Amino acid sequence: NVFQTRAGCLIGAEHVNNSYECDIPIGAGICASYQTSQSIIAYTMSLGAENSVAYSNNSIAIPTNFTISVTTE
Amino acid sequence: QKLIANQFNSAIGKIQDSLSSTPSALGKLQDVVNQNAQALNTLVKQLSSNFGAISSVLNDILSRLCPPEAEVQIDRLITGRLQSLQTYVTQQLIRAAEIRASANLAATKMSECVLGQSKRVDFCGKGYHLMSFPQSAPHGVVFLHVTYVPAQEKNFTTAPAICHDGKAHFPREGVFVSNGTHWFVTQRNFYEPQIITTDNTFVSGNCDVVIGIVNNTVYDPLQPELDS
Amino acid sequence: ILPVSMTKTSVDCTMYICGDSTECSNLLLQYGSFCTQLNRALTGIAVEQDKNTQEVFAQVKQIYKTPPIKDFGGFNFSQILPDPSKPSKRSPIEDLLFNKVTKFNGLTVLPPLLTDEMIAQYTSALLAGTITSGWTFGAGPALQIPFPMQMAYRFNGIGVTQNVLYENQKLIANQFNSAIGKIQDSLSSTPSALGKLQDVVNQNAQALNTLVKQLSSNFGAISSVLNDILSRLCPPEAEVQIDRLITGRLQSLQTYVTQQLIRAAEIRASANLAATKMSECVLGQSKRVDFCGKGYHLMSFPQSAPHGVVFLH
């Protein structure tokens, strides 16, 4: 409940070993959010789901179907 | 065509649900309302400031004092209110340059996404761009970027070339792929396997030159026409 | 080389103007909301530097990683891919880019949201996606493809028939490897190459030094030091001397914040260009002449650098 970030000392937020998308940005890779019994949690932000592309010198993936996406800008 | 039409109709349907359920979506246009309202509220609140004068109100100075001292108290209000306006106009010139950079981008997405089809990656949304539709909004524009996203991969063994009668064959458009026993040529962005033929492929040189060339037959459609 | 962000300064204008003085702070309130709108502007610039960095690097939603074995058909990415030997897993070129680019008065520096090690995980993900799957990781699911067959598609993309690659694949791989090798010699021999990122470090450091040195100015007061006026004089005249310092230190801050808003707009335009080069050069192949370097574009690799991105086109 008292936690040293490289942005400064963070007080009243529960440090969590899990990582999530950045909800409130604290700095130096740290974010916080309000979560479940509820508390403000503080965590190292997750950059994305980790993926390995199944590469080899003779394998190709070809898509057998599509989706017509519509993205609002 | 019915699948693509129904996916398009459904994806246009989801836009109303997305905009209805997400108050942060319009946040880029609402922040342009908020910043310019807050700039005027800050400009108006600065008329309450004394700036070191005996009153913030110019009619107090003019009704209490007389010219030798009133003009000294007024010039503190002129100095502060003029600095308050110079600050506002400087902020509005920098803010206008940001809105102009956004209006030039919106005018470029109108030309390239709406009036055309864009080859520029992630310019007209994520996916391979098909088309875009402009919708107006307060202080802005909204583009509904329609895009083809590929969706159901299969892994295939693949080859750079096929070697036939010592000749190395390459696909004209598409990729060579195998289901594990047979070799096909397919277009790249959608799996559509065709028989490998002298119409689907072009020759260059022989098996010696290409690393990872595979031995397979290439069908010549003229052969049964001469044999029949 | 493109600058993408600048140092997230924030200035405590009440402590810059009236450093730990209640006598001066009660005069600074008479100028109203100037001090709160200076803080609002510097906070807006500082939050924008995290957006500028997010828009350039966070273009990939999944952290792609390379295979253990490097069967790329003769092409050698070892100088642009991460080095596991390091205290932070930058590439051999990113280590050059990080080596070649080089307080109490209410002035502070806030850390960026993404650490240099998060920026390096994003350039690694962009690069491992690029090498293993082509443009496909930008346009949809990452689809694996052999790197000789990806380069053969990049050759058709420039109007050169793909057999020109497969028949010259060792030559093209050796030219690629050697051209990537010359980048390290260029960056190591010519430290002025990073001059576009060092200029962003220098202009921000010079603007802060000019802001600090303007505390030494009298502005017409009997002293530059606020504690001289408050120890020598008393309230009828101390306020006359302090209003000269408040006016000058407030005008000193307004000049800094105005020039940082104009400089932030230049870095934002450079970060929008870098975000466009990431999408069109790295996540794609560009038909746009001289956009992704001189020559017919084949592909590009992002490398992180202090306050910037570097594209190997």
Short mmCIF file of N, CA and C in Angstrom, two decimals, chain B residues 28 38-39 42 45-46 49-53 80 83-84 87-88 90-91 94 97-98 101 119-123 126-128 148-153 155-156 158-161 170-172 174-176 188-189 202-205 209-211, chain C residues 29-34 37 40-41 48 51 59 61 73 135-136 138-146 149 153 156 161-163 166-170 243 247 250-251 254 257-258 261-262 265 268 272 276 279-280 283-285 287-288 291:
data_model
loop_
_atom_site.label_atom_id
_atom_site.label_comp_id
_atom_site.label_asym_id
_atom_site.label_seq_id
_atom_site.Cartn_x
_atom_site.Cartn_y
_atom_site.Cartn_z
N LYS B 28 -12.55 13.04 -29.20
CA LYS B 28 -11.69 13.92 -30.02
C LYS B 28 -12.39 15.20 -30.48
N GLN B 38 -13.29 26.32 -22.37
CA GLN B 38 -12.38 26.58 -21.25
C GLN B 38 -11.44 27.76 -21.50
N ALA B 39 -11.01 27.99 -22.74
CA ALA B 39 -10.22 29.17 -23.11
C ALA B 39 -11.01 30.47 -22.94
N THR B 42 -11.64 31.02 -19.11
CA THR B 42 -10.39 31.54 -18.51
C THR B 42 -10.16 33.01 -18.87
N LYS B 45 -12.87 34.98 -16.74
CA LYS B 45 -12.49 34.99 -15.32
C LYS B 45 -11.35 35.96 -15.04
N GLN B 46 -10.41 36.17 -15.96
CA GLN B 46 -9.33 37.14 -15.80
C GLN B 46 -9.80 38.61 -15.72
N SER B 49 -9.60 39.67 -11.92
CA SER B 49 -8.27 39.83 -11.33
C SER B 49 -7.92 41.29 -11.12
N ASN B 50 -7.26 41.63 -10.01
CA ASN B 50 -6.85 43.01 -9.72
C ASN B 50 -5.61 43.43 -10.52
N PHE B 51 -4.70 42.51 -10.82
CA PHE B 51 -3.38 42.78 -11.40
C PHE B 51 -2.55 43.81 -10.62
N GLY B 52 -2.84 44.01 -9.33
CA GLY B 52 -2.23 45.03 -8.48
C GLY B 52 -2.97 46.37 -8.40
N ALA B 53 -4.07 46.57 -9.13
CA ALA B 53 -4.94 47.73 -8.97
C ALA B 53 -5.74 47.68 -7.66
N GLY B 80 -2.59 44.12 -17.34
CA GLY B 80 -2.99 42.75 -17.04
C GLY B 80 -4.02 42.18 -18.01
N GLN B 83 -2.27 41.56 -21.41
CA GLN B 83 -1.51 40.31 -21.27
C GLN B 83 -2.41 39.07 -21.23
N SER B 84 -3.60 39.18 -20.63
CA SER B 84 -4.64 38.14 -20.60
C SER B 84 -5.21 37.84 -21.98
N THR B 87 -2.23 36.33 -24.24
CA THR B 87 -2.14 34.91 -23.89
C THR B 87 -3.22 34.10 -24.60
N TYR B 88 -4.49 34.50 -24.52
CA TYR B 88 -5.59 33.82 -25.21
C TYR B 88 -5.39 33.73 -26.72
N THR B 90 -2.58 33.96 -28.43
CA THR B 90 -1.44 33.06 -28.68
C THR B 90 -1.85 31.60 -28.56
N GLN B 91 -2.62 31.22 -27.54
CA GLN B 91 -3.16 29.87 -27.40
C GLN B 91 -4.09 29.51 -28.56
N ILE B 94 -1.96 28.74 -31.78
CA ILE B 94 -1.34 27.41 -31.68
C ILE B 94 -2.40 26.30 -31.79
N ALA B 97 -3.59 26.05 -35.45
CA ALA B 97 -2.61 25.28 -36.23
C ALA B 97 -2.76 23.77 -36.04
N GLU B 98 -3.11 23.29 -34.84
CA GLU B 98 -3.45 21.89 -34.59
C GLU B 98 -4.75 21.46 -35.27
N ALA B 101 -3.94 21.24 -39.04
CA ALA B 101 -3.26 19.98 -39.34
C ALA B 101 -4.24 18.80 -39.38
N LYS B 119 -4.04 2.36 -51.16
CA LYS B 119 -3.00 1.35 -50.96
C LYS B 119 -2.12 1.62 -49.74
N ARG B 120 -2.24 2.80 -49.11
CA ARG B 120 -1.47 3.23 -47.94
C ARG B 120 -1.90 2.47 -46.69
N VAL B 121 -1.01 1.67 -46.11
CA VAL B 121 -1.31 0.83 -44.95
C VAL B 121 -1.71 1.65 -43.72
N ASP B 122 -2.77 1.23 -43.04
CA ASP B 122 -3.42 1.86 -41.88
C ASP B 122 -3.82 3.33 -42.07
N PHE B 123 -3.85 3.86 -43.30
CA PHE B 123 -4.32 5.22 -43.54
C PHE B 123 -5.84 5.28 -43.45
N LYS B 126 -7.53 -0.10 -40.19
CA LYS B 126 -6.86 -1.42 -40.14
C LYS B 126 -7.57 -2.44 -41.03
N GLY B 127 -6.81 -3.26 -41.76
CA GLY B 127 -7.31 -4.12 -42.83
C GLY B 127 -6.92 -3.60 -44.21
N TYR B 128 -7.11 -4.39 -45.26
CA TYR B 128 -6.95 -3.92 -46.63
C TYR B 128 -8.15 -3.05 -47.02
N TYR B 148 -11.27 -5.08 -45.86
CA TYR B 148 -11.21 -6.53 -45.89
C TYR B 148 -10.16 -6.99 -44.88
N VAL B 149 -10.56 -7.78 -43.90
CA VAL B 149 -9.65 -8.41 -42.94
C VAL B 149 -9.65 -9.92 -43.20
N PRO B 150 -8.52 -10.58 -43.46
CA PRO B 150 -8.49 -12.03 -43.60
C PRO B 150 -8.72 -12.72 -42.24
N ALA B 151 -9.39 -13.88 -42.18
CA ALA B 151 -9.98 -14.33 -40.92
C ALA B 151 -9.76 -15.79 -40.50
N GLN B 152 -9.47 -16.72 -41.41
CA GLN B 152 -9.40 -18.15 -41.07
C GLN B 152 -8.22 -18.83 -41.77
N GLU B 153 -7.02 -18.64 -41.25
CA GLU B 153 -5.79 -19.24 -41.75
C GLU B 153 -5.83 -20.77 -41.82
N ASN B 155 -2.37 -23.54 -42.43
CA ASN B 155 -0.96 -23.74 -42.75
C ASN B 155 -0.83 -24.65 -43.98
N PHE B 156 0.03 -24.29 -44.92
CA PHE B 156 0.40 -25.10 -46.08
C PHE B 156 1.91 -25.18 -46.23
N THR B 158 4.90 -24.83 -48.81
CA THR B 158 5.02 -23.92 -49.95
C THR B 158 6.38 -24.04 -50.63
N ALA B 159 6.48 -23.59 -51.88
CA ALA B 159 7.70 -23.64 -52.68
C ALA B 159 7.85 -22.35 -53.49
N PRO B 160 9.08 -21.85 -53.71
CA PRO B 160 9.33 -20.69 -54.56
C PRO B 160 9.07 -20.96 -56.04
N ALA B 161 9.28 -22.20 -56.48
CA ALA B 161 9.14 -22.65 -57.85
C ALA B 161 8.80 -24.15 -57.89
N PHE B 170 7.33 -20.57 -62.03
CA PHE B 170 6.96 -19.63 -60.96
C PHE B 170 5.51 -19.18 -61.19
N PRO B 171 4.70 -18.85 -60.17
CA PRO B 171 3.31 -18.47 -60.39
C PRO B 171 3.20 -17.06 -60.98
N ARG B 172 2.30 -16.82 -61.95
CA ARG B 172 2.10 -15.48 -62.53
C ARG B 172 1.55 -14.50 -61.49
N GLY B 174 -0.12 -15.24 -57.41
CA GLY B 174 -0.35 -16.27 -56.41
C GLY B 174 0.91 -16.96 -55.90
N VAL B 175 0.69 -18.05 -55.17
CA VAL B 175 1.66 -18.83 -54.39
C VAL B 175 1.49 -20.29 -54.72
N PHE B 176 2.56 -21.07 -54.80
CA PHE B 176 2.42 -22.52 -54.74
C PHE B 176 2.20 -22.97 -53.30
N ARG B 188 -3.01 -15.01 -53.18
CA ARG B 188 -2.30 -14.85 -51.90
C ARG B 188 -3.21 -14.51 -50.72
N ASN B 189 -4.21 -13.65 -50.92
CA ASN B 189 -5.05 -13.07 -49.86
C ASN B 189 -6.36 -13.83 -49.59
N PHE B 202 4.82 -19.10 -65.18
CA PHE B 202 5.83 -18.70 -66.16
C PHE B 202 7.15 -19.41 -65.88
N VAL B 203 7.92 -19.71 -66.92
CA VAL B 203 9.21 -20.39 -66.80
C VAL B 203 10.35 -19.38 -66.69
N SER B 204 11.38 -19.68 -65.89
CA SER B 204 12.69 -19.05 -66.07
C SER B 204 13.83 -19.97 -65.66
N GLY B 205 14.66 -20.37 -66.62
CA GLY B 205 15.81 -21.22 -66.36
C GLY B 205 15.42 -22.62 -65.90
N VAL B 209 19.23 -23.38 -60.26
CA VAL B 209 19.46 -21.99 -59.81
C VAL B 209 18.66 -21.61 -58.56
N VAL B 210 17.52 -22.26 -58.30
CA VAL B 210 16.54 -21.86 -57.27
C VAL B 210 16.63 -22.74 -56.02
N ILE B 211 16.84 -22.12 -54.86
CA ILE B 211 16.97 -22.80 -53.57
C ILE B 211 15.58 -23.18 -53.05
N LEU C 29 -1.32 35.69 -6.62
CA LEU C 29 -2.77 35.46 -6.72
C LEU C 29 -3.53 36.62 -7.39
N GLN C 30 -3.04 37.86 -7.31
CA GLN C 30 -3.71 39.03 -7.90
C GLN C 30 -3.66 39.04 -9.43
N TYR C 31 -2.76 38.27 -10.03
CA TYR C 31 -2.67 38.06 -11.47
C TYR C 31 -3.62 36.95 -11.96
N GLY C 32 -4.38 36.34 -11.06
CA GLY C 32 -5.41 35.36 -11.36
C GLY C 32 -4.88 34.05 -11.90
N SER C 33 -5.54 33.53 -12.92
CA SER C 33 -5.34 32.19 -13.48
C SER C 33 -4.19 32.08 -14.47
N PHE C 34 -3.21 32.98 -14.48
CA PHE C 34 -2.01 32.79 -15.31
C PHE C 34 -1.20 31.59 -14.85
N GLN C 37 -3.05 28.24 -15.79
CA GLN C 37 -3.04 27.96 -17.23
C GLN C 37 -1.63 27.70 -17.81
N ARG C 40 -1.45 24.02 -16.91
CA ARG C 40 -2.37 23.33 -17.84
C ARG C 40 -1.73 23.11 -19.21
N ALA C 41 -1.05 24.12 -19.75
CA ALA C 41 -0.31 24.02 -21.01
C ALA C 41 0.86 23.04 -20.93
N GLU C 48 0.88 14.79 -24.27
CA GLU C 48 1.04 14.59 -25.71
C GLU C 48 2.32 13.81 -26.04
N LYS C 51 1.38 10.22 -25.99
CA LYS C 51 0.59 9.95 -27.19
C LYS C 51 1.46 9.87 -28.44
N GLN C 59 1.72 0.32 -32.68
CA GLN C 59 0.93 -0.02 -33.88
C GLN C 59 0.62 -1.51 -34.01
N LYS C 61 -0.70 -4.89 -31.94
CA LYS C 61 -1.47 -5.23 -30.73
C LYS C 61 -0.97 -6.48 -29.99
N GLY C 73 17.01 -17.94 -45.19
CA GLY C 73 17.47 -18.12 -46.57
C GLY C 73 18.68 -17.26 -46.96
N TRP C 135 3.76 -7.89 -44.59
CA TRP C 135 2.76 -6.87 -44.23
C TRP C 135 1.55 -7.42 -43.47
N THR C 136 1.37 -8.74 -43.44
CA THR C 136 0.12 -9.36 -43.00
C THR C 136 -0.22 -9.05 -41.54
N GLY C 138 0.12 -6.22 -40.07
CA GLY C 138 -0.51 -4.89 -40.06
C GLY C 138 -1.93 -4.90 -40.63
N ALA C 139 -2.16 -5.71 -41.66
CA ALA C 139 -3.44 -5.83 -42.37
C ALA C 139 -4.43 -6.85 -41.78
N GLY C 140 -4.04 -7.66 -40.79
CA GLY C 140 -4.90 -8.71 -40.25
C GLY C 140 -4.14 -9.64 -39.29
N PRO C 141 -4.44 -10.95 -39.28
CA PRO C 141 -3.66 -11.94 -38.56
C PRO C 141 -2.25 -12.02 -39.14
N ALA C 142 -1.21 -12.20 -38.32
CA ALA C 142 0.11 -12.51 -38.86
C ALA C 142 0.07 -13.89 -39.51
N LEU C 143 0.36 -13.94 -40.81
CA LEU C 143 0.42 -15.15 -41.60
C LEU C 143 1.89 -15.48 -41.83
N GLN C 144 2.42 -16.62 -41.37
CA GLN C 144 3.82 -16.91 -41.64
C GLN C 144 4.08 -17.03 -43.15
N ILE C 145 5.26 -16.65 -43.60
CA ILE C 145 5.74 -16.86 -44.97
C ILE C 145 7.28 -16.95 -44.95
N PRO C 146 7.94 -17.80 -45.76
CA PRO C 146 9.39 -17.85 -45.80
C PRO C 146 10.00 -16.51 -46.22
N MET C 149 10.53 -15.89 -49.96
CA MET C 149 9.24 -15.69 -50.63
C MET C 149 8.59 -14.36 -50.28
N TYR C 153 7.81 -11.46 -53.12
CA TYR C 153 6.63 -10.59 -53.20
C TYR C 153 7.01 -9.11 -53.19
N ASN C 156 8.01 -8.30 -56.82
CA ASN C 156 6.81 -8.02 -57.62
C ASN C 156 6.18 -6.66 -57.28
N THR C 161 10.25 -8.91 -61.79
CA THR C 161 9.65 -10.24 -61.81
C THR C 161 10.28 -11.15 -60.77
N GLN C 162 9.50 -11.87 -59.95
CA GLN C 162 10.04 -12.57 -58.77
C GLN C 162 11.16 -13.59 -59.01
N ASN C 163 11.29 -14.18 -60.20
CA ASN C 163 12.42 -15.06 -60.51
C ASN C 163 13.77 -14.33 -60.46
N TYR C 166 14.78 -15.24 -56.84
CA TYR C 166 15.15 -16.62 -56.55
C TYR C 166 16.41 -17.06 -57.29
N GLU C 167 16.66 -16.51 -58.48
CA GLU C 167 17.88 -16.75 -59.25
C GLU C 167 19.09 -15.94 -58.78
N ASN C 168 18.89 -14.89 -57.97
CA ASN C 168 19.94 -14.05 -57.38
C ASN C 168 19.88 -14.04 -55.84
N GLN C 169 19.34 -15.08 -55.19
CA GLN C 169 18.98 -15.01 -53.77
C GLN C 169 20.19 -14.85 -52.87
N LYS C 170 21.30 -15.54 -53.16
CA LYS C 170 22.57 -15.41 -52.42
C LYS C 170 23.18 -14.02 -52.59
N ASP C 243 6.55 43.03 -7.13
CA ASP C 243 5.77 43.07 -8.37
C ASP C 243 6.63 43.21 -9.63
N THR C 247 6.31 40.20 -12.27
CA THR C 247 6.07 40.53 -13.68
C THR C 247 7.15 39.94 -14.59
N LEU C 250 7.03 35.90 -14.38
CA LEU C 250 5.83 35.48 -15.09
C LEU C 250 5.98 35.60 -16.61
N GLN C 251 6.52 36.71 -17.11
CA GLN C 251 6.83 36.91 -18.53
C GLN C 251 7.94 35.98 -19.04
N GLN C 254 5.90 32.61 -19.36
CA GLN C 254 5.03 32.68 -20.53
C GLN C 254 5.81 32.55 -21.84
N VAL C 257 6.80 28.66 -21.97
CA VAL C 257 5.63 27.83 -22.28
C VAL C 257 5.14 28.08 -23.70
N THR C 258 5.13 29.31 -24.20
CA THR C 258 4.78 29.60 -25.60
C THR C 258 5.72 28.91 -26.57
N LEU C 261 5.12 25.13 -26.49
CA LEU C 261 3.91 24.77 -27.24
C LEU C 261 4.16 24.75 -28.75
N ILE C 262 4.93 25.71 -29.27
CA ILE C 262 5.32 25.74 -30.68
C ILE C 262 6.31 24.60 -31.00
N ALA C 265 4.40 21.26 -31.06
CA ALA C 265 3.72 21.14 -32.35
C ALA C 265 4.64 20.67 -33.49
N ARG C 268 5.22 16.90 -32.55
CA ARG C 268 3.98 16.20 -32.92
C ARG C 268 3.89 15.97 -34.41
N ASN C 272 3.78 12.26 -35.98
CA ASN C 272 2.76 11.89 -36.96
C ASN C 272 3.38 11.35 -38.24
N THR C 276 3.25 7.44 -39.53
CA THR C 276 2.92 7.15 -40.93
C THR C 276 4.00 6.31 -41.61
N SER C 279 3.47 2.71 -40.28
CA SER C 279 2.39 2.02 -40.97
C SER C 279 2.74 1.70 -42.41
N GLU C 280 3.22 2.67 -43.18
CA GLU C 280 3.38 2.51 -44.62
C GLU C 280 4.70 1.87 -45.04
N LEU C 283 4.95 -1.75 -41.70
CA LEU C 283 3.78 -2.62 -41.78
C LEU C 283 3.29 -2.87 -43.22
N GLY C 284 3.94 -2.29 -44.24
CA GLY C 284 3.55 -2.38 -45.64
C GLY C 284 4.74 -2.39 -46.59
N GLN C 285 4.50 -2.10 -47.86
CA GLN C 285 5.52 -1.69 -48.83
C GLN C 285 5.00 -0.46 -49.57
N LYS C 287 4.59 2.44 -52.40
CA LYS C 287 4.72 2.93 -53.77
C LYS C 287 5.04 4.43 -53.85
N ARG C 288 4.95 5.16 -52.73
CA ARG C 288 5.19 6.60 -52.61
C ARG C 288 6.67 6.92 -52.80
N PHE C 291 9.43 8.32 -50.09
CA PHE C 291 8.84 8.31 -48.75
C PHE C 291 9.61 7.38 -47.82
#
